[PDB]
Symmetry: D2
Subunit: 116 residues, 4 copies
Amino acid sequence: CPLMVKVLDAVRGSPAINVAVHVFRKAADDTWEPFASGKTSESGELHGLTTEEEFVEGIYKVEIDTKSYWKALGISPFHEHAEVVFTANDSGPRRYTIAALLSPYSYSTTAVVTNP
Amino acid sequence: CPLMVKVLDAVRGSPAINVAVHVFRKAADDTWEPFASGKTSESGELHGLTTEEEFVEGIYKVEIDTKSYWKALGISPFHEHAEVVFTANDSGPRRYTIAALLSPYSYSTTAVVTN
Amino acid sequence: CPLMVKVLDAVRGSPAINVAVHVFRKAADDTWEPFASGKTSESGELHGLTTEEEFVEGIYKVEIDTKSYWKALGISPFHEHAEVVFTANDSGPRRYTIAALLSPYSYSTTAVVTN
Amino acid sequence: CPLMVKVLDAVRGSPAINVAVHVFRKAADDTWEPFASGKTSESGELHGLTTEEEFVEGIYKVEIDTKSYWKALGISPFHEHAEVVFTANDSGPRRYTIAALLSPYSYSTTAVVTNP
Ligand SMILES: O=C(O)c1cccc(/C=C/c2ccc(B(O)O)cc2Cl)c1
Ligand SMILES: O=C(O)c1cccc(/C=C/c2ccc(B(O)O)cc2Cl)c1
């Protein structure tokens, strides 16, 4: 699994479940092309977005749909989404975990990058 | 000052100085139109981006050029930039501070919205 | 103002107002001796804790009473309090700001140390 | 596993490996009694600190030795340690993950609490 997304809820102290995630990759014309999408499981994890073959070098954007998540809990949050933009695989294949910790008016994101 | 941006450095324990910041407003066709920009000061702050008259309700994006900041310090970073996307809403408090705390492989952002 | 404490609320997007803060200094027998305390202001800030003369090198602990803050808002929190423990060092920059961003099950803290 | 500690490094984008962790429990006389200790593995996780039987109701302090961690990387950090203090098991047994994300002058901690 070359790209995994994990989302946690800082209000409830739990995984953030059923969070929609859309991944985009910058094309040669500088536009953001849809790359993969999914939603977090009961563990707050999203697996299976892509494959080693498909996940080539590029600039990727991981958009985490935080607003939809919060509204369903009765909270009117600040942000539209959390966006995470990074260059991937420019020194060869790596495995990326993109993690996000969510609050209604704040979020934090970190990456764990490992070499297979 | 309806919109202020503040940036801090979690590696050095300091304001993040001379960081480029660009603000965009979402247009009717869903594209991002340049709205305001500047560089953070010695206190890590960027004031004077807009005025009450110009800062109407709508969706805004604040892009913070974190990659260039880390590169200038000789530190290899993860993100191309930090992006903060939010709706300005007239019912809520009037002044928005978008703050960001930067590390090479992580960032955190919060909004302080007050009267 | 060699030591300032600033507290923000990640749920409401606001300063954390009227939060009790206690500062302790580590004594020679390893016990924590009360040093200074106060409540955060309407801007989430606590100034005037100590003076240059009194704030000598040593290990300090800042305890932020987060549990009472959340309980007053009707929100069930995880932590008893947030604790920030650090060494004051004379070589470094002179003014210390200990900042904390609070959520019910999480908190983040940073130091901004400047001249 | 009723209590697990996970530590990540925000400078390197990796697990924080070999981080010492000491857990204390408040005694009846209000002193902090040593409860369990260990260090994080290659995954940044510390398992096996305690058992369901031993981990009774109480106020617990998880002290993560961040200063020692950073000095070994050549960084003179701000904090002595990160302390995480919480009441546990007061509504019956729960499973607790205490996570911490470390930078030289900052750290963030969150808890994931689940009901077995
Ligand atoms: O505190 C922040 O700023 C922060 C930011 C972004 C992510 C995280 C959480 C990471 C995490 C990753 C995996 C597990 B796991 O179920 O083993 C648990 C946790 Cl908490 C914490
Ligand atoms: O993102 C985190 O994890 C984080 C952690 C700890 C503190 C902060 C906030 C810093 C701050 C400091 C001063 C002002 B100010 O009123 O000029 C505003 C802000 Cl938001 C953000």
